[PDB]
Each structure stands twice: as C-alpha cells, then as structure tokens.
Amino acid sequence: EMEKEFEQIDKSGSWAAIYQDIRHEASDFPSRVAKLPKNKNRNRYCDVSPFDHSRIKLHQEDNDYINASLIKMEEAQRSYILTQGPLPNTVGHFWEMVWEQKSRGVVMLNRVMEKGSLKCAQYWPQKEEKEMIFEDTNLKLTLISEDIKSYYTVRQLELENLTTQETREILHFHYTTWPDFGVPESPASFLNFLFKVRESGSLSPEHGPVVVHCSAGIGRSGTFCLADTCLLLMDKRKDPSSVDIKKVLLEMRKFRMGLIQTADQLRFSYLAVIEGAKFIMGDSSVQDQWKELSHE
Numbered sequence: 061e062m063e064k065e066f067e068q069i070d071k072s073g074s075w076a077a078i079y080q081d082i083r084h085e086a087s088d089f090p091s092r093v094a095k096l097p098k099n100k101n102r103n104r105y106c107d108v109s110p111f112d113h114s115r116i117k118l119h120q121e122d123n124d125y126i127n128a129s130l131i132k133m134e135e136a137q138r139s140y141i142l143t144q145g146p147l148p149n150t151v152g153h154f155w156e157m158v159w160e161q162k163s164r165g166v167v168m169l170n171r172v173m174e175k176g177s178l179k180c181a182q183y184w185p186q187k188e189e190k191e192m193i194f195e196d197t198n199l200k201l202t203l204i205s206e207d208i209k210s211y212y213t214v215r216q217l218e219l220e221n222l223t224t225q226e227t228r229e230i231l232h233f234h235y236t237t238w239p240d241f242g243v244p245e246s247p248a249s250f251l252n253f254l255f256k257v258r259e260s261g262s263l264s265p266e267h268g269p270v271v272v273h274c275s276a277g278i279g280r281s282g283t284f285c286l287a288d289t290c291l292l293l294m295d296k297r298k299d300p301s302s303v304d305i306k307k308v309l310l311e312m313r314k315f316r317m318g319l320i321q322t323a324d325q326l327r328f329s330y331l332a333v334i335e336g337a338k339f340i341m342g343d344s345s346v347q348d349q350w351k352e353l354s355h356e
Contacts (some may be wrong), residue, residue: 082309094112145277157199161271165262166230175239208330215232282325286312291340
C-alpha cells in the first residue's frame with residue numbers, strides 16, 4: 061500500500077510531482093501576529109511563520125509571541141511543538157516556552173553552523189561549569205551530562221525557574237548529521253534516533269509536547285514528526301495499509317506551513333515509515349539492527 065505507492069512513484073520518477081500535489085493542497089491560514097512590525101526581530105526567516113490559531117503563546121504580558129506552532133495529531137494522540145532555531149534574542153523565549161508548555165524533550169535536527177552560515181543560536185550550555193542565565197525570562201539552564209554518539213548527542217539539562225526555585229530535567233536530542241535541505245544518511249540511522257527519543261518518554265502523554273526544531277523548524281522537523289505520527293498510527297491499528305502518508309502530511313500542514321521542504325525529504329518519509337513498520341509489525345530484532353547499521 062505505502063510500498064506500491066512507493067515503487068509506483070519511484071519507477072515513474074514523480075516524487076516532485078507528488079510533492080507539488082501536497083504543496084498545492086496545503087492549508088493557508090493567517091499569520092497576522094507573526095507579521096506585526098514589533099515581532100520582526102523574533103522571526104529567523106520572514107517567509108516561515110506560525111499560523112495564529114496554532115501558535116504557542118508565551119505566558120507573559122509584554123509580548124507573547126514566539127515562532128512556534130503546536131501540531132496536534134488527534135488520531136495519533138500525540139502533540140508536537142515545532143519552532144525555529146532560537147535567535148540570539150529569543151533564547152529566553154525558547155526556554156520560557158519549554159517551561160510553560162512543560163516539555164520533557166527538545167529535539168534538534170540541525171547544527172549551529174551549516175554550509176558556513178549560522179542557522180541557530182547556542183541556546184544551551186556546552187560545559188557543566190558555565191551555566192546559562194536568561195535574565196529576560198528569569199530562568200537558569202545547566203548542563204548535567206552529555207552522551208555523544210557518532211551522529212547524535214543526548215544531553216541531560218537542568219532548567220530552573222529563578223522566580224520559584226523549581227527544577228526540571230530536560231533531555232536534548234541533537235541530530236548532527238542531517239543537512240539543511242537534505243535527508244538522514246539512512247532510514248536505519250534516522251529511526252534509531254527517533255526510537256531513542258521515544259525510549260526516554262519525552263513523547264509520552266504524561267509530559268507536555270516535545271519541542272522539535274531545525275533552522276526554520278519545518279523541513280527536517282516535519283520529516284521527524286511525519287514519520288513518528290505515521291508509525292504511531294500504524295501501531296494503534298496494526299494496519300499499515302490504513303495510513304496515508306500524504307494525508308498525514310496535509311493534516312500536519314494545517315498546524316504549520318511548509319512542513320517537509322523537499323521532494324527527497326518526502327521520499328525519505330516513506331522510506332522511514334516503510335522500514336519502521338517492520339518494528340511495529342512484530343519484528344523486535346530490527347531495533348538492534350538499526351543500531352548496528354547506524355554505527356553510533
């Protein structure tokens with residue numbers, strides 16, 4: 061079903077055409093809050109904005125704007141917050157959102173520097189000794205430990221509300237080998253990273269929605285979330301034939317614009333779900349097979 065669709069598109073070579081079909085059909089909603097002149101310096105890219113109905117509001121009286129959208133997958137029963145790579149001035153805003161939304165995980169699918177250009181601010185401490193203080197949002201962030209694997213890094217972070225002295229453990233999942241308008245090296249390595257995020261509980265319902273971001277938070281971020289949702293939908297029904305990836309992407313596109321940026325990214329999305337289905341359909345050993353194939 062998702063493979064007959066795959067082979068049909070591949071042998072014809074119409075990924076670009078299938079993708080335009082998505083681009084044409086995607087929802088269009090007003091971004092009036094994001095476009096206000098006072099929020100000009102809060103957006104990384106002018107042409108990537110959260111819709112007004114699904115945007116996350118910061119819990120402050122001054123300015124509640126942050127370039128972030130809540131993607132609510134009702135059937136899948138999972139919610140994601142997709143945001144841009146924090147700007148130098150929105151780093152406080154970012155962690156304010158994390159604290160307010162009660163997020164357990166932060167998934168980063170981009171590097172700070174990519175293709176020689178700055179794609180995101182250093183918004184978390186790199187060294188245990190030098191913790192970060194965000195004066196504008198009254199928050200503390202300390203690095204507790206990091207586990208650097210060959211292509212991703214998991215970090216344990218301590219977030220502290222300086223107002224109440226309340227503490228929270230944040231997990232930071234940093235994918236380091238995923239190019240800007242590119243794809244992961246293999247479905248094997250991607251899924252391994254996804255299932256590592258899954259294993260932490262950061263996606264579980266007892267926590268606020270996970271924060272997913274790349275540079276703009278639509279391309280790679282959309283790829284991560286689409287794949288996760290599809291697999292989750294497949295798991296709920298135990299019926300791989302029942303999930304229509306294109307339909308899931310369009311459903312997602314109701315909450316945030318331009319999710320998945322290239323036709324190749326869509327091709328990967330299929331590849332990731334088809335392979336991940338194996339683990340969902342009762343083959344537990346492929347989980348360890350992805351870990352061997354990724355060389356982490």
